[PDB]
Ligand binder design. Sequence first.
Ligand SMILES: CSC[C@H]1N[C@@H](c2c[nH]c3c2N=CNC3N)[C@H](O)[C@@H]1O
Ligand SMILES: CSC[C@H]1N[C@@H](c2c[nH]c3c2N=CN[C@H]3N)[C@H](O)[C@@H]1O
Lengths: 231, 231
Amino acid sequence: LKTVAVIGAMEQEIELLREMMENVKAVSFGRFSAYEGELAGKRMVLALSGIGKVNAAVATAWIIREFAADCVINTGSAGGLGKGLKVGDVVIGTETAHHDVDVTAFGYAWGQVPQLPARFASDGILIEAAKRAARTFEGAAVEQGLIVSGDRFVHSSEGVAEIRKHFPEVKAVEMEAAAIAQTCHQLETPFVIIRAVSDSADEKADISFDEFLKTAAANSAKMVAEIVKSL
Amino acid sequence: LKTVAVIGAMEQEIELLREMMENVKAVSFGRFSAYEGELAGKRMVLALSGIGKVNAAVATAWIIREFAADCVINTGSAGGLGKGLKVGDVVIGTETAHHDVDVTAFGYAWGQVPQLPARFASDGILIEAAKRAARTFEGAAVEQGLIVSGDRFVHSSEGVAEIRKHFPEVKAVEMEAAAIAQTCHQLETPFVIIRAVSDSADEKADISFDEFLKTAAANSAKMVAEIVKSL
Ligand SMILES: CSC[C@H]1N[C@@H](c2c[nH]c3c2N=CNC3N)[C@H](O)[C@@H]1O
Ligand SMILES: CSC[C@H]1N[C@@H](c2c[nH]c3c2N=CN[C@H]3N)[C@H](O)[C@@H]1O
């Protein structure tokens, strides 16, 4: 873990981390942008992927290729579905899955992309680093568990019920984590997903999201920065 | 266009093209494999993406970045939604959109990734090449129009219903083209999508696909090889 890649979807989700970096250098690939520098004593490349699975996948593949990233950490906001979660709480995604993949017609489990596992496991070392960071993390409650992704912003009770039917133990929902996870799997690169709650993915999710994005972004980022220091 | 990238999801969709190529070198990037050779005095890099949006997007970005591809052509099978489409018929995808993207909560149009256009237009020069290629297959059935993609295999007369609701003029549905399109958009690369019908995306789509993949792959491939010769 020499070079750490950190991927966030939206500017609000990377700004704090960017302000924390030293010797920052802007870099880009077509329309994607990133920032190369250091945090703690670690080389870090912080990328802005844009929203959704294709954007996150391409950005992640780029940083891995271009910078030989040793691991990848996703940061940002998400819909909270876990028992007892509140706005600002952080979830360490120990497993990630696509909630909107369905090739069941050919025998695959719901969410399973053909030729791949149904879920993607975050790296054991990185999970461990995140758990250690949680032990002294004061800004918010932290939990661990499953985060699922798909190419939609979920904002209905019916939408959440669909996802819980396939993923009963789900803790959070968003739109990039499973794409980043699947990309790292395919590129044999360890990763972990860190997200914080901006909403409940329910009928009010869009209204809550815009209000709580900055708080979710910050809490997620502060956890991510603790992890990087520890590596 | 001197270096052409050709992207197919499945071995069966690239096998003929691979056999047509000369001076072929195998290349890889993690679990992704491609073949760099020549076809008709063009440099061709033929990539096996794997199924679905993440896989297609990563393989496409990799080939653009590593090989400096001048354009990208997708080849493969798709479910026929256009009126009258038969197994084996080819669709030149002139426009592409994601059918399963939904950030409508924040005002975006159905299918539209935030900050991206709702649909992605294939390159004019490539579409005209496809149209010339089509005329060389005398009698053959070739149409032009909208192809939509999502991370699921459609095999339901009502799954189709709902797609048609959002995209009335839709001609075909599959799982990679909009990811390739979006990736090319973001990396400023011209592309065109060529697919052939393996099924009608209804309840029999699975058995139709199993039987007619070889046919759809072949017809798509032959069209793509002729397009390469026309650039
Ligand atoms: C503006 S779209 C939502 C962005 N924030 C994340 C997220 C927060 N809350 C939700 C998100 N994604 C889906 N459903 C939700 N309820 C997603 O990963 C997107 O990058
Ligand atoms: C084995 S999954 C189907 C593969 N073939 C394509 C396709 C054929 N027929 C359909 C596909 N995709 C979605 N719905 C369909 N009815 C997709 O792009 C996948 O790569």
